[PDB]
Design a protein around this motif. Structure first.
Motif, PDB file in Angstrom:
ATOM      1  N   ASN B  53       0.833  -1.226   0.000  1.00 57.09           N
ATOM      2  CA  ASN B  53       0.000   0.000   0.000  1.00 57.09           C
ATOM      3  C   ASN B  53       0.831   1.224   0.000  1.00 57.09           C
ATOM      4  O   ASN B  53       0.525   2.229  -0.738  1.00 57.09           O
ATOM      5  CB  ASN B  53      -1.032   0.031   1.121  1.00 57.09           C
ATOM      6  CG  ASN B  53      -2.119  -1.006   0.925  1.00 57.09           C
ATOM      7  OD1 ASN B  53      -2.445  -1.349  -0.196  1.00 57.09           O
ATOM      8  ND2 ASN B  53      -2.639  -1.552   2.009  1.00 57.09           N
ATOM      9  N   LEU B  56       2.098   1.841  -3.570  1.00 53.51           N
ATOM     10  CA  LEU B  56       0.991   2.307  -4.368  1.00 53.51           C
ATOM     11  C   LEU B  56       0.545   3.731  -3.997  1.00 53.51           C
ATOM     12  O   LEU B  56       0.189   4.554  -4.889  1.00 53.51           O
ATOM     13  CB  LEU B  56      -0.169   1.315  -4.206  1.00 53.51           C
ATOM     14  CG  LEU B  56       0.072  -0.060  -4.865  1.00 53.51           C
ATOM     15  CD1 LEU B  56      -1.198  -0.875  -4.572  1.00 53.51           C
ATOM     16  CD2 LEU B  56       0.384  -0.061  -6.387  1.00 53.51           C
ATOM     17  N   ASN B  57       0.471   3.991  -2.690  1.00 52.44           N
ATOM     18  CA  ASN B  57      -0.012   5.274  -2.228  1.00 52.44           C
ATOM     19  C   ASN B  57       0.990   6.446  -2.506  1.00 52.44           C
ATOM     20  O   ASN B  57       0.585   7.605  -2.586  1.00 52.44           O
ATOM     21  CB  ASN B  57      -0.418   5.201  -0.741  1.00 52.44           C
ATOM     22  CG  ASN B  57      -1.736   4.487  -0.546  1.00 52.44           C
ATOM     23  OD1 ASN B  57      -2.557   4.489  -1.476  1.00 52.44           O
ATOM     24  ND2 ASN B  57      -1.955   3.851   0.615  1.00 52.44           N
ATOM     25  N   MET B  66      -5.146   4.051 -10.379  1.00 52.75           N
ATOM     26  CA  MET B  66      -5.066   3.533  -8.960  1.00 52.75           C
ATOM     27  C   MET B  66      -6.453   3.199  -8.502  1.00 52.75           C
ATOM     28  O   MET B  66      -6.663   2.254  -7.698  1.00 52.75           O
ATOM     29  CB  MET B  66      -4.449   4.587  -8.015  1.00 52.75           C
ATOM     30  CG  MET B  66      -2.974   4.851  -8.293  1.00 52.75           C
ATOM     31  SD  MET B  66      -1.968   3.317  -8.140  1.00 52.75           S
ATOM     32  CE  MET B  66      -0.447   3.782  -8.884  1.00 52.75           C
ATOM     33  N   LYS B  70      -7.784  -0.448  -7.211  1.00 57.12           N
ATOM     34  CA  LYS B  70      -8.639  -0.694  -6.063  1.00 57.12           C
ATOM     35  C   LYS B  70      -9.798  -1.611  -6.388  1.00 57.12           C
ATOM     36  O   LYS B  70     -10.094  -2.574  -5.631  1.00 57.12           O
ATOM     37  CB  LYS B  70      -9.180   0.622  -5.495  1.00 57.12           C
ATOM     38  CG  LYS B  70      -8.150   1.308  -4.678  1.00 57.12           C
ATOM     39  CD  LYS B  70      -8.676   2.635  -4.174  1.00 57.12           C
ATOM     40  CE  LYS B  70      -7.559   3.390  -3.461  1.00 57.12           C
ATOM     41  NZ  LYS B  70      -7.752   4.820  -3.736  1.00 57.12           N
ATOM     42  N   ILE B  73      -8.602  -5.071  -6.918  1.00 55.71           N
ATOM     43  CA  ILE B  73      -8.266  -5.608  -5.571  1.00 55.71           C
ATOM     44  C   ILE B  73      -9.544  -6.037  -4.799  1.00 55.71           C
ATOM     45  O   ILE B  73      -9.591  -7.118  -4.137  1.00 55.71           O
ATOM     46  CB  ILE B  73      -7.393  -4.555  -4.809  1.00 55.71           C
ATOM     47  CG1 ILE B  73      -5.968  -4.604  -5.372  1.00 55.71           C
ATOM     48  CG2 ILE B  73      -7.343  -4.856  -3.342  1.00 55.71           C
ATOM     49  CD1 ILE B  73      -5.113  -3.428  -5.090  1.00 55.71           C
ATOM     50  N   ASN B  74     -10.549  -5.184  -4.848  1.00 56.63           N
ATOM     51  CA  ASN B  74     -11.834  -5.520  -4.202  1.00 56.63           C
ATOM     52  C   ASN B  74     -12.494  -6.812  -4.714  1.00 56.63           C
ATOM     53  O   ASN B  74     -12.935  -7.625  -3.924  1.00 56.63           O
ATOM     54  CB  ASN B  74     -12.818  -4.399  -4.345  1.00 56.63           C
ATOM     55  CG  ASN B  74     -12.398  -3.158  -3.594  1.00 56.63           C
ATOM     56  OD1 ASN B  74     -11.618  -3.204  -2.648  1.00 56.63           O
ATOM     57  ND2 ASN B  74     -12.955  -2.023  -4.015  1.00 56.63           N
ATOM     58  N   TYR B 130      -1.505 -10.775  -1.722  1.00 57.32           N
ATOM     59  CA  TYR B 130      -1.839  -9.420  -2.168  1.00 57.32           C
ATOM     60  C   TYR B 130      -1.080  -8.942  -3.395  1.00 57.32           C
ATOM     61  O   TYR B 130      -1.704  -8.413  -4.339  1.00 57.32           O
ATOM     62  CB  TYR B 130      -1.685  -8.415  -1.018  1.00 57.32           C
ATOM     63  CG  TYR B 130      -2.203  -7.011  -1.230  1.00 57.32           C
ATOM     64  CD1 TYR B 130      -3.253  -6.732  -2.066  1.00 57.32           C
ATOM     65  CD2 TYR B 130      -1.665  -5.944  -0.485  1.00 57.32           C
ATOM     66  CE1 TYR B 130      -3.719  -5.457  -2.203  1.00 57.32           C
ATOM     67  CE2 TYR B 130      -2.185  -4.662  -0.572  1.00 57.32           C
ATOM     68  CZ  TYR B 130      -3.194  -4.440  -1.438  1.00 57.32           C
ATOM     69  OH  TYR B 130      -3.700  -3.191  -1.540  1.00 57.32           O
TER      70      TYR B 130
HETATM   71  N1  LIG Z   1      -3.134   3.723  -4.452  1.00 62.66           N
HETATM   72  C1  LIG Z   1      -3.788   2.390  -4.320  1.00 62.66           C
HETATM   73  C2  LIG Z   1      -4.118   1.612  -5.419  1.00 62.66           C
HETATM   74  C3  LIG Z   1      -4.689   0.316  -5.183  1.00 62.66           C
HETATM   75  C4  LIG Z   1      -4.986  -0.170  -3.887  1.00 62.66           C
HETATM   76  C5  LIG Z   1      -4.674   0.637  -2.818  1.00 62.66           C
HETATM   77  C6  LIG Z   1      -4.086   1.874  -3.028  1.00 62.66           C
HETATM   78  N2  LIG Z   1      -3.918   2.454  -1.705  1.00 62.66           N
HETATM   79  C7  LIG Z   1      -4.371   1.590  -0.683  1.00 62.66           C
HETATM   80  O1  LIG Z   1      -4.358   1.779   0.508  1.00 62.66           O
HETATM   81  N3  LIG Z   1      -4.861   0.469  -1.368  1.00 62.66           N
HETATM   82  C8  LIG Z   1      -5.517  -0.684  -0.776  1.00 62.66           C
HETATM   83  C9  LIG Z   1      -7.021  -0.627  -1.194  1.00 62.66           C
HETATM   84  C10 LIG Z   1      -7.526  -1.699  -1.905  1.00 62.66           C
HETATM   85  C11 LIG Z   1      -8.857  -1.745  -2.308  1.00 62.66           C
HETATM   86  C12 LIG Z   1      -9.726  -0.687  -2.007  1.00 62.66           C
HETATM   87  C13 LIG Z   1      -9.250   0.427  -1.282  1.00 62.66           C
HETATM   88  C14 LIG Z   1      -7.898   0.457  -0.884  1.00 62.66           C
END
Ligand SMILES: Nc1cccc2c1[nH]c(=O)n2Cc1ccccc1
Ligand SMILES: Nc1cccc2c1[nH]c(=O)n2Cc1ccccc1
Ligand SMILES: Nc1cccc2c1[nH]c(=O)n2Cc1ccccc1
Ligand SMILES: Nc1cccc2c1[nH]c(=O)n2Cc1ccccc1
Ligand SMILES: Nc1cccc2c1[nH]c(=O)n2Cc1ccccc1
Ligand SMILES: Nc1cccc2c1[nH]c(=O)n2Cc1ccccc1
Lengths: 219, 219, 219, 219, 219, 219
Positions: B53, B56-57, B66, B70, B73-74, B130
């Motif tokens: 994170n 990415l952040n 980004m 997210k 990732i979800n 992850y």
């Molecule tokens: N910049 C970025 C891009 C992708 C995932 C990220 C981030 N920053 C985070 O903290 N996350 C984790 C996270 C995943 C899913 C939904 C919300 C946040």
């Protein structure tokens, strides 16, 4: 910072020149753009309160911000003191005293006290509690110095959709919406503020659409 | 990250300034060119979800990407949760709880939890699970931001063969063909899209020809 | 890579940002000039096959070359498999399986498998066997991208002898002559391709002459 | 400096090239801007008096300042000597002698003596006592070289409020007001020196207002 | 190289990216100026023969020089072989074989053999013996590429004495006079080649004069 | 250098690329400005005589200076030999021989001998004794190359006092006055060489005045 060594124990290490310079240069280059916060958090990995003050104090510009940050820090320290009052007078000889807000903030505590708290069993993570207060303050500053309302981020008649979405989520990040709202404004404000051509395409997609789908659609 | 120390054991180490800056600079220079993915994978060697994170952040631009990430990732976290549901309520005192999708993603888990998973026997490699999700997302972005279809990569009348093949395999890499197709498009689309002079030479070579042979031939 | 630590044993270490960046920058600056090969070999000191793929994959340009290299790698892996077939089906529980060509190449093997091979007693040096295949491929590329035949390296009428010899041995190195031929072409092609004034001087020296003597002579 | 090693004890380490260069470059870039002080304090983390002299002596310019600093150091050393006189004549063989002011300042003490003081049980923290004297001197220099009185920091008719507050707190920092006064001058001199438009807004806010509130107000 | 670790023993370490790049850049900047030799010697501190070849091979230009160097290396290796012949045929199983010239030069020896020689008791310092041969070769190259005879270094009519002495000893260093001659040419060729005004001053000083005295005199 | 390791003992370490480059670059940038001396002393922290020669030898320019330095070194070595003669002939097998001047200077001693002296109990600190000789020589060079007499440093009619004092103490430092004289020339030559306006102010201050007071006065 406090680090684990190579042969197993938590000890104080000098803040490195590389760290010091990285932080100063990130501020010089990026000011209060929102990505500076995670950079700060990571450069202050393992920091004591002294180290945190060090990083903050090495910043030369932005003294309005640093003063707002002091104020935010003072408000958190006072709330800390409300929650966790310390018995006054003389401490038991050779024992650990309890941290006050100003102790956690590094203004009334020595390095040695901060080390003792941080490495005690159980530990009082003063470096992490202070860091949280700092980040709280920093996020207020990010928000404040955000130059544009999300209401004014609108797609130009020949602005590529991607570039508009980049502006939109950059603005939203600074204005500091919840991840509910970042998850959400996609099916609503993002479409509304799209240009007429792209907007028709997006409406026609129907709801439920991912951002990827929308970005493909208005390619 | 989690590293082995010099005297034999797995411990948390601060993400370095060098790493932080390398990642930020690679994104600034190369955006979503496909070579940024292996660079990301390597800079995040041993990363915890927090470290992931962090990297990415720290990226300031590309917020459309980004946000797509997210979303990806979800979707992986929800599939993780479908596969490996966690029993709710209160955990056995002092025991390791089971990671949920959001735990692996670092949004609902502490550093200490992530360390415990990663160094447990047997380990739950949350940093690697992850990272896989992130790379999955990143590859979608690479593909999306690929500016040219392989169908439009065609050798110019006086473009050196090498330069054309460079364009062709660069495009193919971004469009993200299988290594079957990279192995394959050589005896087919590569020849078809060659210019007339080189094309005659290549046809005349006969099939079976290696790329080296083709590149020598149209030298 | 796999390194010896400070307290005596072979363990996996993360590939460093410095290494990653050095390799990428050497390719950007020098492309396939022959000196990039020893640089590659040295930057990949102790590399696992994963690390080798990492370095190769971080290269953004030159995708014709990287594709030729894949092909060369595939041919070596198939020859490896001809030499050292692996018994198929299920492996003895908890035992080391035998590497196939694709395992050595890092495409069908995990990091953990590669570590186990490399640190086993006796070791299977998969990182070194793969590196040899890569260098084999790379040398073909150097040769291919050599822009000039040694037959065209001829001393200009007022070109200093040293500058000509520099061009000559630079070309020869890329064309990849044996050290017999580098030892040899001195008393023959080097003299022949000298300009008329220097050539008379060199002939008159008589045979047996070292390069130093020749270079002094035509000073 | 004196550092803890990886296997538990306090030992002398060479001052690093990175540290040496960082300090020299910070002085070259920032002269006596107030942020150079915390940078100095942090670059001299763990310093012996020798290391402190080293850093000071590597500065090439600013010799008026370095001479003022010597003077301040001399005054502190004399006060040290007033407080803690040392018995003269011959020391007990092989025992630790007591530091004089000039010993703490590194001019009459060896590296080995400084190490012995610093690592003794109980320790005489000569590196920290000298550092305090240096910083005392440095702060006088910061103040002296402050180019502008806070009385002359006044908001321009179309100067953004933020930029004015930045000038104001930058000036105040150099003039070196107490944090009482930095906490305080906000509801008074900051408002007074605001421009007429912003001043009306601020007065109308009423007293008690945070800086954040004031900065929002005059946005 | 071979280094002592932190916990007491001689082990192989990867040549660093920093070292590799330093050497390549020093050659690019300084070519065969005489100061590159001590730089080479120091960058190859602890080098194995492999490391030495690595550094040499990473050089892209100057291939005439590198070829002269090979020749010098070959002559030393043949003299080594004259001095220390090795018994041919099969080696005692699991024993250390004796190094030949080509073994010391790294062309017929493995890394593991070189490590065994270098860390044996008693050690065969192959890295140091090869380094000596290389430096021997390098010094010949320095001399050869010296652009000016010391006989042509003469003080200009308005050239400051210091600048002339700088040219003179720079030239002498490249031409590679003994330290007898560097100690000596001061009371002779240095004066002779001085300009008329300075020459009168120097003669009048009388003999015995140090360089300092001469340089003061012609200030 | 000789360093203490992480697990307690004095061992030889390779001089680092960072150190080598720092020294070379400081000479290139600053020549013999007086601040280069403390930089040299600090970069050669823990140096053996070999390391000292290394640093000196890597300097490419300034060969007049390096030759003066050799001469100074020779004079100190001869005085060393006068003080501490060594018995000639054959040394007791396997014992430490006594260092001569040329041994301390690194010209007739091996690295291993220098290590043995430096780490013996009791130690012969050859690296520190040589360093002192070098610095002695270097200070003569600083003085010699000082471009201006302190008698010519005079305040310009509109030169700010600070800038004049900077010139004055910079010159004095190079001319290498005692700290008596640096403490002293303040109430005398500094005032005398002030311009008429500032001079009246300073006289009127009365004697006893600190430099700070004088610098405030002529602000
Ligand atoms: N910049 C970025 C891009 C992708 C995932 C990220 C981030 N920053 C985070 O903290 N996350 C984790 C996270 C995943 C899913 C939904 C919300 C946040
Ligand atoms: N530059 C900066 C910004 C924020 C807090 C800071 C600093 N420098 C410090 O020493 N602190 C701690 C502190 C907190 C509260 C009030 C007074 C000082
Ligand atoms: N960039 C590059 C060049 C050569 C080999 C490579 C790569 N990237 C990889 O992952 N490999 C291994 C691999 C070998 C054979 C066929 C397919 C892939
Ligand atoms: N550059 C500098 C500035 C301040 C103090 C310094 C130095 N260099 C030193 O060696 N010192 C110590 C010292 C203190 C008091 C009087 C004489 C010298
Ligand atoms: N670039 C270079 C210069 C000098 C010697 C070198 C090299 N590269 C090598 O591998 N060597 C060793 C070697 C010595 C003798 C004859 C053949 C090769
Ligand atoms: N560059 C330089 C300057 C001063 C002394 C030096 C060097 N290089 C060396 O090797 N030395 C030692 C040495 C001292 C005395 C006379 C001869 C050589």
């Amino acid at each position: 910072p406090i680090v684990q060594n190579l042969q197993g124990q938590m000890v104080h290490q000098c803040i490195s020149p590389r760290t010091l310079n990285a932080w100063v240069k990130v501020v010089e280059e990026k000011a209060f753009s929102p990505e500076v916060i995670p950079m700060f958090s990571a450069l202050s990995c393992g920091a004591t309160p002294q180290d945190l003050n060090t990083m903050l104090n090495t910043v030369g510009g932005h003294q309005a911000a640093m003063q707002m940050l002091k104020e935010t820090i003072n408000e958190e320290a006072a709330e800390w003191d409300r929650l966790h009052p310390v018995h006054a007078g003389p401490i038991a000889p050779g024992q650990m005293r309890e941290p006050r807000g100003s102790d956690i903030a590094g203004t009334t505590s020595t390095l040695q006290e901060q080390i003792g708290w941080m490495t005690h069993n159980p530990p009082i993570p003063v470096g992490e509690i202070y860091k949280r207060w700092i980040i709280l303050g920093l996020n207020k500053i990010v928000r404040m110095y955000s130059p544009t309302s999300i209401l004014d981020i609108r797609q130009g008649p020949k602005e590529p959709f991607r570039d508009y979405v980049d502006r939109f989520y950059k603005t939203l990040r600074a204005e500091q919406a919840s991840q509910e709202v970042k998850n959400a404004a996609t099916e609503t404000l993002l479409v509304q503020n799209a240009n007429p051509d792209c907007k028709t395409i997006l409406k026609a997609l129907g709801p439920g659409a991912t951002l990827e789908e929308m970005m493909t659609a208005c390619q």
